């Protein structure tokens, strides 16, 4: 609802196409921070809603090291960037499980401690 | 120190390269472009014409913006024609 507020102003002025859009600030970014998730949505189900706008190559769900349950945020890289422009913009503020999730562009830095979780995820997304 | 700097640079590069979208990197332009699995049934229309991933459930999920961009897209494209045609004297 922070970002959703921008695009309405932006569009209203007829900004139209990325050169003048704030989405142009990125261009080298693909991963999207996916916030305010419900707790029971897992990687496969976050890999349901987000293929509407593109083809995901990677995904990471943030979850506590001990109990292994959702922190409530994920990082999902689309194959073709412009999906990011599309997902952030179009799907932000949308309800799943009662709570309206947040998306925004992100620069994502991998962490050693999950290293195996990368191949374990990749191998499934490497199937396609 | 120099070696350290070099290492840092390398890591930065790695970070950036990992982050970059795949189609741009091969790029040079603009059933998958990179052979990734693609959907089957007809999808909703889109600004960029991108096709949903094979794994899509098939429900509309949208705030409703993507359709409102077309309304503005059509508008702006229409008033370029209306401006001359409604001109009079």
């Amino acid at each position: 609802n922070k970002i959703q507020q921008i695009n309405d102003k932006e569009l209203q002025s007829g900004i139209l196409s990325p050169h003048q859009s704030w989405h142009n600030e990125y261009k080298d970014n693909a991963y999207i921070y996916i916030g305010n998730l419900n707790r029971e949505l897992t990687e496969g189900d976050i890999l349901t809603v987000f293929s509407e706008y593109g083809v995901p190559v990677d995904v990471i769900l943030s979850r506590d090291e001990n109990t292994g349950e959702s922190q409530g945020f994920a990082y999902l890289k689309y194959e073709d960037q412009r999906s990011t422009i599309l997902a952030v913009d179009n799907l932000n503020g949308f309800k799943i499980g009662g709570r309206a999730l947040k998306i925004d562009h992100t620069f994502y830095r991998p962490k050693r401690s999950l290293q195996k979780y990368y191949e374990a995820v990749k191998e499934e997304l490497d199937r396609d | 120190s120099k070696y350290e700097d070099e290492k840092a640079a390398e890591r930065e590069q790695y970070l950036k390269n990992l982050n970059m979208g795949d189609v741009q990197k091969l790029g040079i332009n603009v059933t998958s472009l990179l052979g990734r699995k693609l959907y089957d049934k007809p999808a909703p229309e889109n600004r960029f014409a991108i096709m949903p991933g094979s794994r899509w459930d098939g429900v509309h999920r949208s705030n409703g913006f993507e359709e409102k961009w077309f309304a503005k897209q059509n508008e702006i494209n229409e008033k370029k024609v209306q401006s001359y045609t409604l001109q009079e004297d």
Binding site: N38, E40, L41, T42, E43, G44, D45, L47, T48, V49, V59, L61, R63, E65, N66, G68, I96, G97, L114, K116, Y117, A120, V121, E124 | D57, V59
Partner: peptide, 22 residues
């Protein structure tokens, strides 16, 4: 050698996504 990592992904449907449609 016991487990790769204690965490690991799922790739399993939750009842929430299917439920909302029906």
């Amino acid at each position: 050698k016991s487990q790769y990592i204690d965490i690991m992904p799922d790739f399993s449907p939750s009842g929430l996504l299917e439920l909302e449609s029906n």
